[PDB]
Design a binder for this molecule. Structure first.
Ligand SMILES: [Mg+2]
Ligand SMILES: [Zn+2]
Lengths: 55, 145, 57, 189, 104, 68, 144, 143, 75
RNA sequence: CCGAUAACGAACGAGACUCUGGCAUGCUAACUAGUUACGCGACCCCCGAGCGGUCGGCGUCCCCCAACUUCUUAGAGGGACAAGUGGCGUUCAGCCACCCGAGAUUGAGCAAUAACAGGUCUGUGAUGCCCUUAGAUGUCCGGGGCUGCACGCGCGCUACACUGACUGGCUCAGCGUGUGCCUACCCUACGCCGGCAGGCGCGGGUAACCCGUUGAACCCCAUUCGUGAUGGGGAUCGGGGAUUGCAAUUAUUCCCCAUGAACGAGGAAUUCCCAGUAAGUGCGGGUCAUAAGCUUGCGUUGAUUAAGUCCCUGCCCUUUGUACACACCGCC
C-alpha cells in the first residue's frame, strides 16, 4: 500500500523478526552461537560448519 | 506452666459473627475468620502485644477486644497499607481490611458490578465458567457433572 | 575486546561462511566439475581455492 | 570393641541358628562404627551377605518415594530406634535385631504358575538369604505402616516392631505376615 | 627495544594446533628467546542437539552435534625487541592466531 | 563370558607365530613389544589382544603341535 | 630438632569431590578447611571422618600435623574424600619418611577395614539419554 | 589455648553473638521487623522477635569466612526453596532490603566497613569481637 | 477410632496422673505420653521438659525429630 | 570362534573403530589454574607459648621481586590382555572362582541386504502434475481465532502428610550460557531507594580474566505444630502493586493481602527400570521482548530386588505341516 502501512507493523522481536538464514523459514530456528539457522537446514550443513558427531 | 486448664477457658470464642476454636494456637485460631489469614493474624497479634506461645482459650476478654480492634482498624495501628485486602476500593477508594459477612457481600458487590456493565469477567462469572482465562477443554468437569 | 566477537560465535561464523560459500559455488560451478573449496584464511588477507576438474572453464 | 554408634558392642551378640549365621553380619569382621558405607554391595551375587545387617536395615527403611536417598535421616532413625529398644527392654539393640531377623524370616513360601488353589500352587522352602531379605523387608514395612498416620514416630514404631519380632507375640506385622506365609505353604503342600 | 608478547592460538583439531604450537616454540629456542610453555586453556564444547527428523513423526530420536574449540597460549618474552625477531607465524588452515603484547 | 577372540586377532596371531616363532615367548609383555616392530597394528587394543592370543598359542605350541 | 621440608600432599576423591590432605611434621593437628575435624557439617556421619584415626591410633598421628582442603561434590561425598585423604596421607608420610614395614602395618589395618580409605571408588554418574528422564529410565509409553 | 570462631560450633556461636548484640543494644533495628518476611519464598514470617539480631550475628559470621560480600551475595546466601504451589519448586533469593539494612546496621556498629572494591568486610574492631565471643562460646561448651 | 480430641491443656485428674506414674516407666517420649495420657503432643513436649527441670526424669536423646527420656535409676 | 565338511576362496553386518568414564605424586607446562614456603599484616591469644591458631586479607611476572605441579587445566604417552593361579571343557574354542590391580563388561556414536504405498509437498530459490493469479489461494495492514467446554483419552506437575509442614541457623555442585551481518533483544558484581516483585547510578566480561570460591536444592542442626481435611494441599476467586511490549481484555509473566475446593494412597488394567541404576532433589541449554508443569543435558542424596526362565508378550536358528503368497488382520 502507501508507504506508511506496507511494512508498518513493528517487527523488532518475536518469531516474525527472525528467519532461517538459508531457507527464509521461521520455524525451528537455532539462534544459539549465532547460527540463526533452520532446524532442518542445520542438519544439512552441520558437517560443513564443523559440528561433527562424536556421541 | 502446663497446668490445669484455666478456669476462664473458652473452648470456642465468638469474635465478630464467627466462632473460633479456643483449643488451638491464637495466631492459628483467628484464621477461622474470613479475611484473616496466617500472615495477617501474626502482624495484628504482634502489634496487639499478646503472647505468641499461648492458646486462644486462655486469652482474656480485654485481650480479645484488643485483638478485634486491631483487625477492624489496622491503618491506625501502623499495619502497612500493602498488607490489607480491599486496598484502593473501586467504589470509595479508601484502604481497608474486611473480615466478615462484609467480605462476602463485597465479593458479591464487585460480582454484580461486573455483571451490571456485563464485562467479560462478569459474563464468565454468571455462566459459571473460569474467569482467569485458563483452558476449559479438559478441566473443571466435576463442577458440571 | 568488545568489538571482537567471541571465539564460540567466531568459529561458528567461519563454518557458516564456508558452508554458504560451498553452496554458492556448488550451484554455480556444478557443470564445470566443482569438487570442493579450501579456505586458507589469514589475519591479513583470506584466500579461497576452488577445486574443479575443468579449470579452463 | 568397634562400638556401633559409639556404644553397643558387637562381640557379645549371637545367632541362635546356623541356617542364618553366615548371611547375618554383626560379628567382629563386619562390625562397623556407623551404618553407612558405599561399599558396592549390589555389584554381584552374595555380596549382600557380607554387608552389615544394620546397613541392610538402614537401606530398607528409605522407601515409599518420599525417602529414596535420605540415608542420613534413616541412620538417625536406626540410631534412635536402637536407643529406645535398649532403654525399653534392657539388652543389646543388635541382639534384638538378630532375633527379629531370625524370628521373622518365613521358613517356607508357595510359588508356581499352574491353576492356584488360593494364592500359589506348590509349597517351596525358601533360601537362607531370602530369609534375611524377607525379614528385613517385613520389619520395615511393619514400622512404616504403623507410623503412617499417628503421633508415634518412626523410631518408636521401628522399636516396637523389632522388640515384638524378637519375641513373637502376634503383634509384629512381620511375624503376622510370616505365620500367614507358613499357613499358605502348609495348606498348599 | 624491550617487549613481551602473548601469542594465543585457537583451532578445532588438536593435531594441527599441537603442530603449530611446536614450531613457534622450537623456532624461538633457535632464536634464543625465552618461552613460557604453551598453556592449554580448557576445551570449549559447543553442543547442539537437534531432533533427527524433519517431519516431527518418529520415535523421538535426537541428534547430538559437538564442536570442540581448543585454545593455547605461548608467551614469547625475549629481552630484545621481538616483533622483528618473530616476523612469522607459520600457520596451517584451521588455526587462528592473535599477536598481543602485555598492554592488552 | 564374551571374550571370544575374533578372526583378526587369531588370524594375525598365527601368522606372527610362524613368521617369528624364535623371537616370541610366553610373556604377554615381551611378545606385545615384538608385535610392535614386526607388524603395523593400527590399534593398541588390537595388539594386546593379538599379543594375548599369541601367548595362548605359544604356551600351547610348546606342548602340542598347533595348526600353525 | 628443626628439620623442615618434611611434608606430603595426598588427595582423595569420591564422586567428583576432591580433598587434598597436607601432611607435615608437628604436634598432632588434623584440620579440614581450617576447622577441627570434630566441627564438621553432617555430624550424622562424624564417625566416618574419625574412622581412620580410631583404627590406626592417635599415637601414630601424634607426630603429624594434617590440614585437608576440600572443594568439590556434595555433603557426604566430601566426607569420603576427607577420610580418604587423611588415611592416604599418613600411609604416604610413613611410606617416604620411615620404613615401609611401618607403612605395611598402617596400610593393612585400613585396607582390611574399608578399602575406600586407600583405593578410590571409580563409579561417577551416567549420561541421560534422549528417551527418558534419567540414564536408564524411559518415559511412560501408551498404546491407546 | 586461643580460640577462633572456625574452632567452635557455628550454630551455637551465632546464637551467642545474637545475644551479645541484643544486650549491647545499639543495633539499628528497622521499624518493619515485626511486619516483613525475610524472603519472597517464605509463606510465614519469622518466629523469633529478635530475628534482626540473629541475621546480623549470622551475617557478621559470614563476612568472617569470606569478605567482599554485598547485598546480592547476602540474598544468595539466605535464599532458599520456593515451593510455588502446583508449580515445580525452584530457588529464590532472599530479601535485599533485610540484607541491606542488616549490613547498614553493622557499619553503624563499627564492626563492618566497605572494601576498596564492591561489598564490605569486617573491621579489626569487628574481627576482635567475633573472636572473643568465639573465646567464650568454647569455654561455655567445654565447661 | 474416629477422632481423638486430646487434651490441649491439663485437667487436675490428668496432671497428677502425669506426676505420679509417668516418671516410673522406662520409655518416656512425647509420642508415648500423648497416646497414654490423651494429651495433644505439644503439651507432651511441654510437660516432659518441665519434669526434666525438676530432675525427676532423665534425658538421653534430645534430637529434633525424637526426644527420649527415662526414669531415674533405682537403688 | 573351534571343528567336521561338495565345497573353496571371499564381501557387508557383528567385532575392530570414534568419543566419554575410571588410574597414573611418571613427562610437558601454566600472574586468564592453583598448592606449599616465605614476608607483611588483622585478630584471638597470653600462661607463654610463637615454626601458635584462623584469614578466599596483601605481596614475592608490578620480572629478578619464591619454589613446585600434589590438587586445576590439556597434550604426548603408558595401562587390561581372560594376562596369572585353580577347576571344568573334545582339554580346542571357551566358561567359572580368586590374587595382584584404578579398572577383570563405563556409557554412548556409527551401524548390512531387502522392504513399508510408515511420516514429511507446513524446512528449503528440492520437485512433477493439478489449482489460483489483480474482488489473488500472491503480499501487506486492523481485528478475531488457533485457548473457545455437557464429555472421553494420552504425556506430566502438585499432593494426600509427623520418614512431615513451618521459622531460624549451618553447609556442599556440575554441565553450560553470556552484548547480536540482517537483528532492535546479553550475563551481571557493587552502592542507594522499596516490604516484595522492582527502580535508580556506577562498573566487569566477546570470557579458565567479570557474573563466580557459580555460598543451588534435597540433606543437616535447632523451633513451633500434634493425627483434625490441621500450620497438610493450594485449586478457585476478589482487591492492589510492578516488569516486557506498539498493544496484557479471553487474566503474558512476577509480587502482596484475602477464599482455602477435591485429594485420607487410588477398580479393572498398565509403564519404566539391574549400580552411582530406580527414585528424591535442584541447576543449565533450547524455545525466550515477556516466560517452563515440556524437552535436552548436569550435578546432589542413593537404595530394594535379581545373576534366572520361556510362564505371558515377542525375537533368532533347525525340523515339520499347510488348501496360506495382499502371506492367519490368510483362506474358507
Ligand atoms: Mg499454616
Ligand atoms: Zn532452514
Amino acid at each position: 500500500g502507501h508507504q506508511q502501512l506496507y511494512w508498518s507493523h513493528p517487527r523488532k522481536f518475536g518469531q516474525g523478526s527472525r528467519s532461517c538464514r538459508v531457507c527464509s523459514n521461521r520455524h525451528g530456528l537455532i539462534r544459539k552461537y549465532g547460527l540463526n539457522m533452520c532446524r532442518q537446514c542445520f542438519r544439512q550443513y552441520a558437517k560443513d560448519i564443523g559440528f561433527i558427531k562424536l556421541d | 506452666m502446663s497446668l490445669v486448664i484455666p478456669e476462664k477457658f473458652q473452648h470456642i470464642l465468638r469474635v465478630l459473627n464467627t466462632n473460633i476454636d479456643g483449643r488451638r494456637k491464637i495466631a492459628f485460631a483467628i484464621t477461622a475468620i474470613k479475611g484473616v489469614g496466617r500472615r495477617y493474624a501474626h502482624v495484628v497479634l504482634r502489634k496487639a502485644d499478646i503472647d505468641l506461645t499461648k492458646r486462644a482459650g486462655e486469652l482474656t476478654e480485654d485481650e480479645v477486644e484488643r485483638v478485634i480492634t486491631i483487625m477492624q482498624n489496622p491503618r491506625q495501628y501502623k499495619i502497612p497499607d500493602w498488607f490489607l485486602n480491599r486496598q484502593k476500593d473501586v467504589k470509595d477508594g479508601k484502604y481497608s481490611q474486611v473480615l466478615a459477612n462484609g467480605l462476602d457481600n463485597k465479593l458479591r458487590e464487585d460480582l454484580e458490578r461486573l455483571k451490571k456493565i456485563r464485562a467479560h469477567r462478569g459474563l464468565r462469572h454468571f455462566w459459571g465458567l473460569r474467569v482467569r482465562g485458563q483452558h476449559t477443554k479438559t478441566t473443571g468437569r466435576r463442577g458440571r457433572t | 575486546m568488545a568489538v571482537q566477537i567471541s571465539k564460540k560465535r567466531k568459529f561458528v561464523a567461519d563454518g557458516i561462511f564456508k558452508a554458504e560459500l560451498n553452496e554458492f559455488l556448488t550451484r554455480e560451478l556444478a557443470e564445470d566439475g566443482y569438487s570442493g573449496v579450501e579456505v586458507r584464511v589469514t589475519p591479513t588477507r583470506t584466500e579461497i581455492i576452488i577445486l574443479a576438474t575443468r579449470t579452463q572453464n | 570393641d568397634i562400638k556401633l554408634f559409639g556404644k553397643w558392642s558387637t562381640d557379645d551378640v549371637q545367632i541362635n541358628d546356623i541356617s542364618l549365621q553366615d548371611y547375618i553380619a554383626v560379628k567382629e569382621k563386619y562390625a562397623k562404627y556407623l551404618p553407612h558405607s558405599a561399599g558396592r554391595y549390589a555389584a554381584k551375587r552374595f555380596r549382600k551377605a557380607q554387608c552389615p545387617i544394620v546397613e541392610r536395615l538402614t537401606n530398607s527403611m528409605m522407601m515409599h518415594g518420599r525417602n529414596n536417598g535420605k540415608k542420613l535421616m534413616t541412620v538417625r532413625i536406626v540410631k534412635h530406634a536402637f536407643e529406645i529398644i535398649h532403654l525399653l527392654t534392657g539388652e543389646n539393640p543388635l541382639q534384638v535385631l538378630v532375633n527379629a531377623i531370625i524370628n521373622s524370616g518365613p521358613r517356607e513360601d508357595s510359588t508356581r504358575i499352574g491353576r492356584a488353589g488360593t494364592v500359589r500352587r506348590q509349597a517351596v522352602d525358601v533360601s537362607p538369604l531370602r530369609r534375611v531379605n524377607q525379614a528385613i523387608w517385613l520389619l520395615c514395612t511393619g514400622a512404616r505402616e504403623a507410623a503412617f498416620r499417628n503421633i508415634k514416630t518412626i523410631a518408636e514404631c521401628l522399636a516396637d516392631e523389632l522388640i515384638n519380632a524378637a519375641k513373637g507375640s502376634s503383634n509384629s506385622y512381620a511375624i503376622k505376615k510370616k505365620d500367614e506365609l507358613e499357613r499358605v505353604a502348609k495348606s498348599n503342600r | 627495544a624491550i617487549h613481551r608478547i602473548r601469542i594465543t592460538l585457537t583451532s578445532r583439531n588438536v593435531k594441527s594446533l599441537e603442530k603449530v604450537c611446536a614450531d613457534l616454540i622450537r623456532g624461538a629456542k633457535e632464536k634464543n628467546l625465552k618461552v613460557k610453555g604453551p598453556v592449554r586453556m580448557p576445551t570449549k564444547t559447543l553442543r547442539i542437539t537437534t531432533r533427527k527428523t524433519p517431519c516431527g513423526e518418529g520415535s523421538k530420536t535426537w541428534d547430538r552435534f559437538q564442536m570442540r574449540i581448543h585454545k593455547r597460549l605461548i608467551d614469547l618474552h625475549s629481552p630484545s625487541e621481538i616483533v622483528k625477531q618473530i616476523t612469522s607465524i607459520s600457520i596451517e588452515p584451521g588455526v587462528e592466531v592473535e599477536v598481543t603484547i602485555a598492554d592488552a | 563370558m564374551g571374550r571370544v577372540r575374533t578372526k583378526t586377532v587369531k588370524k594375525a596371531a598365527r601368522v606372527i607365530i610362524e613368521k617369528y616363532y624364535t623371537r616370541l615367548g610366553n610373556d604377554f609383555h615381551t611378545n606385545k613389544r615384538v608385535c610392535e616392530e614386526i607388524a603395523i597394528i593400527p590399534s593398541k587394543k588390537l595388539r594386546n589382544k593379538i599379543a594375548g592370543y599369541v601367548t595362548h598359542l605359544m604356551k600351547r605350541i610348546q606342548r602340542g603341535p598347533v595348526r600353525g | 630438632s628443626k628439620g623442615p621440608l618434611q611434608s606430603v600432599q595426598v588427595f582423595g576423591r569420591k564422586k567428583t569431590a576432591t580433598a587434598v590432605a597436607h601432611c607435615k611434621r608437628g604436634n598432632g593437628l588434623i584440620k579440614v578447611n581450617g576447622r577441627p575435624l570434630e566441627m564438621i557439617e553432617p555430624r550424622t556421619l562424624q564417625y566416618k571422618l574419625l574412622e581412620p584415626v580410631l583404627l590406626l591410633g592417635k599415637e601414630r598421628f601424634a607426630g603429624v600435623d594434617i590440614r585437608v582442603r576440600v572443594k568439590g561434590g556434595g555433603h557426604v561425598a566430601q566426607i569420603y574424600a576427607i577420610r580418604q585423604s587423611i588415611s592416604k596421607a599418613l600411609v604416604a608420610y610413613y611410606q617416604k619418611y620411615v620404613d615401609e614395614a611401618s607403612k605395611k602395618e598402617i596400610k593393612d589395618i585400613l585396607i582390611q577395614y574399608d578399602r575406600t580409605l586407600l583405593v578410590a571408588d571409580p563409579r561417577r554418574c551416567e549420561s541421560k539419554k534422549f528417551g527418558g528422564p534419567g540414564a536408564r529410565a524411559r518415559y511412560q509409553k501408551s498404546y491407546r | 589455648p586461643g580460640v577462633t570462631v572456625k574452632d567452635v560450633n557455628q550454630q551455637e556461636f551465632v546464637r551467642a553473638l545474637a545475644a551479645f548484640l541484643k544486650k549491647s543494644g545499639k543495633l539499628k533495628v528497622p521499624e518493619w521487623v515485626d511486619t516483613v518476611k525475610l524472603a519472597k519464598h517464605k509463606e510465614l514470617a519469622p518466629y523469633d522477635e529478635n530475628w534482626f539480631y540473629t541475621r546480623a550475628a549470622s551475617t557478621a559470621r559470614h563476612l568472617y569466612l569470606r569478605g567482599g560480600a554485598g547485598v546480592g551475595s547476602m540474598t544468595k546466601i539466605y535464599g532458599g526453596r520456593q515451593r510455588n504451589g502446583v508449580m515445580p519448586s525452584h530457588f529464590s533469593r532472599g530479601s535485599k532490603s533485610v540484607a541491606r539494612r542488616v549490613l547498614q546496621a553493622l557499619e553503624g556498629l563499627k564492626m563492618v566497613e566497605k572494601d576498596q572494591d564492591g561489598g564490605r568486610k569486617l573491621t579489626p574492631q569487628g574481627q576482635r569481637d567475633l573472636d572473643r565471643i568465639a573465646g567464650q562460646v568454647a569455654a561455655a561448651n567445654k565447661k | 477410632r474416629d477422632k481423638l480430641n486430646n487434651l490441649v491443656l491439663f485437667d487436675k485428674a490428668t496432671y497428677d496422673k502425669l506426676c505420679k506414674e509417668v516418671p516410673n516407666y522406662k520409655l518416656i517420649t512425647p509420642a508415648v505420653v500423648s497416646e497414654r495420657l490423651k494429651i495433644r503432643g505439644s503439651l507432651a513436649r511441654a510437660a516432659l521438659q518441665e519434669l526434666l527441670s525438676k530432675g525427676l526424669i532423665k534425658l538421653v536423646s534430645k534430637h529434633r525429630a525424637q526426644v527420649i527420656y527415662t526414669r531415674n535409676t533405682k537403688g
